[PDB]
Design a protein around this nucleic acid. Structure first.
Lengths: 247, 194, 50, 53, 133, 147, 257
RNA sequence: CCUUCUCAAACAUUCUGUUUGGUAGUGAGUGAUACUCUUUGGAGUUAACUUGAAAUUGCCUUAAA
């Protein structure tokens, strides 16, 4: 059975999300067409919150950057609209507690504002990338003889040879190279490690785990804000700290 | 002649008058001398600088304030029926008795010496048609103000009580304990009839 | 009307004096030094249990 | 029977802001937080004034 | 007696035909659901009507939702007698402005403005006002 | 019941630890270098039946399970007498939770913050309609004739 | 430049129309008092229904006598200040009185964005809160968030809809930027909305304020700023449902249609 | 039973000044002559007031068990 309160709450929250996404869609469409006559702001800010919580306000350069998008689950009563289904299908992040690597350009950044209440972003370090690939990694390929959908593990390097090989990639560390440094084979290996499977925080419902989830749940709204405006500054967080928690 | 108002909209209507008639010299009459000790505290608190006259204050104060009202130009006082007997001032335009009077016959003599009107829902000159929308929205402001001062809680307590005690010690068929206390309390701003 | 006509006390409107008594007891305890203040209690655990 | 440090500083505040207008002094919500009468205030201030100048 | 058609009022801010059909579907197979809305802008008047295919289902829903505190205002549900059917309630969206303007030439509307302006000066003189130009 | 507690949980009486830490904060600050009266639920039977009959009660919550039943038998009808909008809620444990006690038997809500005022007034009207109107037959009818 | 003679003649005809042959002032006093100067155009802001209040610069304050003898009127004039969540943590009412009693304006109540969405979120509590106040001021940031928090009934008037005030010196909050901008909005500016249609009246207010020679200076500068910024059609001075007073009349803007 | 579009530039430093742009609102009703367009249909405006958020039908799943 579905209660009445929930069924109205879902619509009341998606009203805010449909109107919010349309609003961001309009200002980003009017920013690209150079018809900046009467809008809120014709440029892009990025907020970098670090750790006693300093909120930085820096403008986004034209430079291509490397991001590690992490799935969150938020907000509460929301059902995802068509514009969210599309972007999260393209980034293959339908599952909660799931990461992916993408390069950030002037085309990537407008799509980032749409999914910002669903994802937590940030520029990782060399150890965050390297430890993540050597700890977690999936490869969708053929099983014994018949079965196709096996996703196993990055155990070997000869599997890396058979699937990539001729692009110049021979080993798992070479995949780490083309992911950390933006190269030719990045679009080749990015869809090879499809997504990552990060474990959730706390990971229990009980005595200690409920209280620890309470402590972290109130830490969420402090370390992350929903701007909801068409000039939403993109919240960047420390991924070295976050993946220290998720590894 | 008279204005018809409920016990809720009684002091509401009075307060609506005194702000607009700040320029003029008008007279408000009460039954009790313990009712004026409330009104001449509220109106001085909400900055309508009225004058105070009752039996419970000293004679030199009663003389030196009433003298100042005679020599004034813009002033306004609050006095009872019994205390204002024999000393009437021609410098007046509205004689407005708020409570029911002591003698229903002697009040006629009080007038022809100014414009006279009464206030009666439970109970010559013309009546006055009254707009319901343009009363001042100072009731919840007074309800917050009463339960946060103590002194004005006590003066309202002995405002409401003394008024209602004088209402029961009347003689007319009209003024014989008919008015319900769920309305009369909100005149002095209460959630319960004390 | 309510059943009894009991006059409401001053203390029902004024800030509480029992609270004032407790506060001015802990004040003494801090002057004497037998209660360590909440600000310094953080500093006693920032230096210890490392 | 002397007065405490906090009581003295409280009476300092009342005198410096008002002076002698006990009606205004007791109707003040900011300094007369305990809704005390005029007689309490003039007695306590004179104790304060005798111990001072 | 009573009938399958139901009346619901005091609806929450954003409780529409989508959620009236979905929630009251759990009580059973509903026939036909509507909600009265403004035409100037597409939003609810906070009352609607829905019909069940079963009369007994209508009275069971009424028994369980007559006083239901739901996000700031309690749902009021009433059964209907034989007759009084669900008739004329249309799904009205947000109505947009349509730009019908120029068509007539500039010289036509100019002398129309001259006619209305000179008559306007000849209007004040009809009731105790004298004004130059 | 859930909607009554969604309001009543916003007025937990300040627990012994919370009161102790705050009043040491008063001491650590005020001795070295204005507040309104705070609102909480009111929870003793001597105090609730004091508050009711003085008409200082807007919602009086009464437990259905009390150790001697004779304790709280006058209370619903005294509330109907005074005009106090009462609700007999299920569980003295469930009342206990919102009040730092094991059990409470009674919980009252005298005064309220203005944010919660409209919700409280509607909680009164919902309880009047849901409880007092459905159970006008309960002043009649001897219960427990179950075969 | 508009003829000042026709403005003098207009207000004199308004004096004559107000001098014409109940115990409260329900409608009689408002129809006596309320002057409105109409401004017509071919489609003001033709497709966008934004709620910006155009702050038309005026030499002489009408808000000042509006204060002085709204003290006599039953509906009182009280100055509201909507601020942001850090401001009330920083700045009290006493500092505002310290720096604004110097000229003689009084801040009635300071209000957070929190307060409009929790305590004054009940509809009758919201309506009875705002309708009490005539001057509504709001810090630049919160202004865009305010159609939701205070609703539509707060926007149906011209009084109750807020005025965007800058309080940020290079994004950092300062008291001084508030202190001088509250002055400029109060004494040197008259707010008016811009509807998506054709007709616009400017609520100048009570006819009794600022002796008619001063009223000429008010109307003059209003036209000096509304004809320069926008191409317009017609201007009328009007007390509530009078035979209208045609003031300005243009025949060169319509040629583009 | 979720809570709401919480700031940007261009110029100027008088210890913050000017200019530019940014907001689509619960519903229902009472309402005294004016504004332009349209060609008859109200289209869109223009004071004000009523009201417990009131109401009888305008043609992703560790936010779980």
């Amino acid at each position: 059975f579905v209660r009445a309160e929930s069924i109205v709450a879902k619509t009341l929250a998606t009203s805010r999300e449909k109107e919010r996404i349309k609003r961001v869609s309009i200002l980003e469409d009017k920013k690209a067409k150079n018809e900046t006559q009467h809008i809120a702001s014709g440029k892009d800010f990025i907020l970098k919150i670090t750790e006693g919580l300093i909120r930085e306000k820096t403008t986004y350069d034209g430079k291509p950057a490397l991001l590690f998008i992490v799935r969150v689950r938020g907000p509460l009563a929301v059902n995802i609209p068509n514009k969210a289904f599309k972007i999260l299908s393209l980034l293959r992040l339908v599952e909660t507690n799931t990461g992916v690597f993408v390069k950030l350009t002037k085309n990537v950044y407008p799509l980032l504002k749409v999914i910002a209440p669903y994802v937590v972003i940030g520029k990782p370090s060399l150890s965050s990338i390297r430890s993540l690939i050597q700890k977690r990694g999936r490869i969708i390929y053929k099983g014994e003889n018949e079965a196709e959908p096996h996703e196993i593990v990055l155990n070997d390097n000869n599997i890396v040879e058979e699937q990539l090989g001729d692009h110049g990639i021979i080993c798992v560390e070479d995949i780490i190279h083309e992911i950390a440094t933006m190269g030719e084979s990045f679009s080749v290996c990015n869809f090879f490690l499809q997504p990552f499977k990060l474990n959730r925080e706390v990971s229990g419902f009980g005595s200690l785990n409920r209280l620890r989830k309470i402590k972290q749940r109130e830490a969420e709204s402090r370390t992350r804000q929903f701007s909801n405006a068409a000039t939403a500054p993109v919240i960047e967080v420390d991924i070295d700290s976050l993946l220290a928690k998720l590894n | 002649g008279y204005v018809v108002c409920d016990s809720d909209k009684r002091f509401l209507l009075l307060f609506s008058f005194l702000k607009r008639n700040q320029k003029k010299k008008i007279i408000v009459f009460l039954s009790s001398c313990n009712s004026v000790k409330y009104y001449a505290e509220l109106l001085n608190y909400i900055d309508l600088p009225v004058l105070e006259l009752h039996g419970k204050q000293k004679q030199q104060k009663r003389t030196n304030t009433f003298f100042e009202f005679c020599n004034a130009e813009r002033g306004i006082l609050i006095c009872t029926d019994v205390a204002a007997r024999g000393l009437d001032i021609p410098a007046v335009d509205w004689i407005i008795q708020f409570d029911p009077p002591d003698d229903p016959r002697d009040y006629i003599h009080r007038v022809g010496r100014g414009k006279s009107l009464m206030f009666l829902t439970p109970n010559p000159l013309n009546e006055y048609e009254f707009p319901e929308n343009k009363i001042a929205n100072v009731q919840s402001q007074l309800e917050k103000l009463i339960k946060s001062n103590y002194y004005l809680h006590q003066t309202a307590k002995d405002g409401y009580r003394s008024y209602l005690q004088a209402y029961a010690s009347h003689s007319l068929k009209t003024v014989y304990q008919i008015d319900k206390l769920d309305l009369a309390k909100v005149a002095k701003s209460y959630g319960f009839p004390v | 009307m309510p059943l009894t006509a009991v006059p409401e006390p001053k203390r029902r409107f004024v800030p509480s004096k029992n609270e004032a008594k407790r506060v001015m007891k802990i004040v003494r305890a801090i002057r004497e030094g037998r209660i360590i203040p909440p600000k310094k209690l953080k500093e006693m655990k920032e230096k210890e249990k490392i | 029977r002397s007065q405490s440090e906090r009581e003295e500083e409280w009476l300092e505040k009342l005198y410096k802001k008002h002076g002698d207008d006990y009606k205004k002094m007791f109707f003040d919500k900011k300094l007369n937080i305990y809704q005390q009468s005029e007689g309490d205030l003039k007695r306590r201030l004179l104790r304060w004034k005798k111990r001072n100048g | 007696e009573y009938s399958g058609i139901i009346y619901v009022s005091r609806l929450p801010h954003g409780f529409h035909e989508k959620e009236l059909s979905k929630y009251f579907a759990q009580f059973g197979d509903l026939k036909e659901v509507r909600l009265a809305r403004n035409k100037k802008t597409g939003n609810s008047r906070h009352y609607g009507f829905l019909e069940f295919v079963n009369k007994e289902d209508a009275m069971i829903a009424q028994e369980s939702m007559n006083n239901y505190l739901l996000m700031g205002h309690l749902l009021q549900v009433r059964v209907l007698p034989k007759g009084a059917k669900i008739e004329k309630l249309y799904k009205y969206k947000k109505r947009v402005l349509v730009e019908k303007g120029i068509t007539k030439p500039v010289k036509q509307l100019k002398d129309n403005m001259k006619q209305k302006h000179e008559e306007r000066i000849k209007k004040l003189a009809k009731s105790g006002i004298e004004f130059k130009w | 019941a859930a909607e009554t507690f969604k309001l009543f949980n916003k007025y937990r009486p300040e627990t012994a630890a919370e009161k102790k830490e705050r009043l040491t904060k008063e001491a650590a600050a005020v001795a070295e270098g204005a507040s309104p009266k705070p609102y909480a639920v009111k929870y003793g039977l001597n105090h609730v039946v004091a508050l009711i009959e003085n008409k200082k009660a807007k919602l009086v919550l009464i437990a259905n399970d009390v150790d001697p039943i004779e304790l709280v038998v006058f209370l619903p009808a005294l509330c109907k007498k005074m005009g106090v909008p009462y609700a007999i809620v299920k569980g003295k444990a469930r009342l206990g939770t919102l009040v730092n006690q094991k059990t409470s038997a009674v919980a009252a809500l005298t005064e309220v913050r203005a944010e919660d005022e409209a919700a409280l007034a509607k909680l009164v009207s919902t309880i009047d309609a849901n409880f007092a109107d459905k159970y006008d037959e309960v002043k009649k009818h001897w219960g427990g004739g179950i075969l | 430049a508009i003829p000042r003679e026709r403005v003098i003649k207009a207000v004199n005809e308004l004096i004559k129309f107000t001098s014409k042959p109940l115990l409260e002032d329900d409608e009689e006093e408002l129809k006596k008092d309320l002057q409105l100067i109409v401004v017509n155009n071919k489609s003001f802001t033709g497709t966008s229904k934004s709620f910006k209040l155009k702050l038309l610069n005026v030499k002489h304050s009408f808000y000042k006598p509006w204060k002085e003898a709204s003290a006599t009127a039953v509906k009182d004039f009280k100055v509201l200040l909507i601020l942001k969540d850090s401001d009330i943590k920083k700045v009290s009412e006493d500092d505002l009185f310290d720096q604004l009693d110097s000229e003689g304006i009084k801040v009635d109540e300071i209000i957070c964005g929190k307060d409009l969405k929790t305590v004054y979120k009940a509809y009758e509590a919201r309506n009875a809160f705002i309708s009490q106040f005539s001057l509504i001021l709001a810090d630049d940031s919160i202004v865009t968030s305010l159609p939701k928090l205070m609703g539509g009934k707060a926007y149906n008037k011209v009084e109750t809809t807020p005025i965007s005030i800058r309080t940020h010196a290079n994004k950092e909050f300062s008291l001084t930027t508030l202190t001088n901008n509250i002055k400029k909005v109060y004494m040197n500016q008259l707010p008016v909305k811009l509807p998506r249609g054709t007709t616009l009246n400017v609520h100048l207010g009570n006819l009794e304020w600022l002796r008619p020679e001063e009223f000429v200076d008010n109307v003059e500068l209003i036209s000096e700023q509304l004809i320069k910024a926008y191409q317009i059609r017609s201007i009328f001075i009007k007390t509530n449902r009078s035979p209208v007073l045609p003031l300005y009349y243009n025949q060169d803007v319509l040629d583009e249609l």
